[PDB]
Design a protein around this ligand. Structure first.
Ligand SMILES: *[C@@H]1O[C@H](CO)[C@@H](O[C@@H]2O[C@H](CO)[C@@H](O)[C@H](O)[C@H]2NC(C)=O)[C@H](O)[C@H]1NC(C)=O
Lengths: 42, 64
């Protein structure tokens, strides 16, 4: 589970949550508020 | 944090632009004999550096 993913040649390491709906998530995980990096599971 | 690099009379002019994650700098240094405003005249800035920063910019600030 070490390897992770979410303009040209951009890089974006910001750790802020998916505000996946109208909720201001304030870093709290829940419905419409999800951690921004997935991982592979090799 | 992935990148690091090293290298009124004095009017110094610069251009800063970001394209495809490169940061491009052009410059020109000249004497002048004026105070309130940029002198009415012409010369071209020439390229200094072309740095592979890969980073987003929308705001900037100057250090005195
Ligand atoms: C570069 O930074 C700007 C912010 O300074 C980003 O623009 C925002 O993008 C989000 C995407 O969801 C929008 O909700 C905001 O309305 C945008 N704000 C402004 C001021 O335009 C931009 O997307 C960033 N680009 C990259 C590739 O990181």
């Amino acid at each position: 589970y070490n390897y992770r993913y979410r303009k040209p040649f951009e890089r974006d390491i910001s750790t802020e949550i998916y505000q996946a709906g109208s909720k201001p998530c304030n870093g709290v995980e829940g419905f419409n508020c999800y951690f921004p990096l997935q991982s592979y599971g090799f | 944090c992935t990148f690091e690099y090293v290298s009124f009379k004095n009017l110094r002019e610069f251009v800063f632009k970001n394209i495809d994650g490169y940061f491009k700098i052009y410059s020109k240094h000249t004497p002048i004999n004026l105070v309130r405003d940029l002198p009415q005249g012409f010369s071209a800035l020439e390229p200094l550096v072309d740095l592979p920063i890969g980073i987003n910019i929308t705001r900037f600030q100057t250090l005195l």
